[PDB]
Amino acid sequence: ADKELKFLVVDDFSTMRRIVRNLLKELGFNNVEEAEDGVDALNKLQAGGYGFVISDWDMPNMDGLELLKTIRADGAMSALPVLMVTARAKKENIIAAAQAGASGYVVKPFTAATLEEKLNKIFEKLGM
Numbered sequence: 001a002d003k004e005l006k007f008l009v010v011d012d013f014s015t016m017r018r019i020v021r022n023l024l025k026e027l028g029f030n031n032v033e034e035a036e037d038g039v040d041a042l043n044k045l046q047a048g049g050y051g052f053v054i055s056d057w058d059m060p061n062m063d064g065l066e067l068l069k070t071i072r073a074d075g076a077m078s079a080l081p082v083l084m085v086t087a088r089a090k091k092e093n094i095i096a097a098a099q100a101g102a103s104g105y106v107v108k109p110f111t112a113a114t115l116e117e118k119l120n121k122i123f124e125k126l127g128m
């Protein structure tokens with residue numbers, strides 16, 4: 001049943017969505033959907049059933065910081081985990097995402113090992 005947790009993987013670079021979804025599959029999570037920007041992601045989220053978001057930052061139409069802030073401000077999903085996975089590596093970028101409620105932060109390019117470590121840190125708090 002834990003492995004039924006529903007992920008939304010958001011990035012305008014489809015190669016990154018593949019990498020993240022495939023790591024999830026190796027960890028036993030197959031209930032995974034994708035979105036290419038924050039608008040498409042928010043539309044999927046508002047439809048219900050999600051339990052974890054993994055999101056890029058720079059994307060057209062709505063970026064990942066805007067998405068994160070929207071999620072955190074929406075009482076229907078305000079505690080949804082949101083893992084930032086972004087090429088933006090400056091301390092001030094990390095601080096901004098953190099202050100906005102990010103559950104974790106991974107810099108691209110990444111190893112699957114790093115990504116797993118960050119996911120586990122959050123799972124640990126989900127009691128998984």
Ligand code: BEF
Binds near residue numbers: 059086087
């Ligand atoms: F475009 Be992302 F923030 F790497």
Ligand SMILES: [Mn+2]
Binds near residue numbers: 011012013057058059
């Ligand atoms: Mn991007």
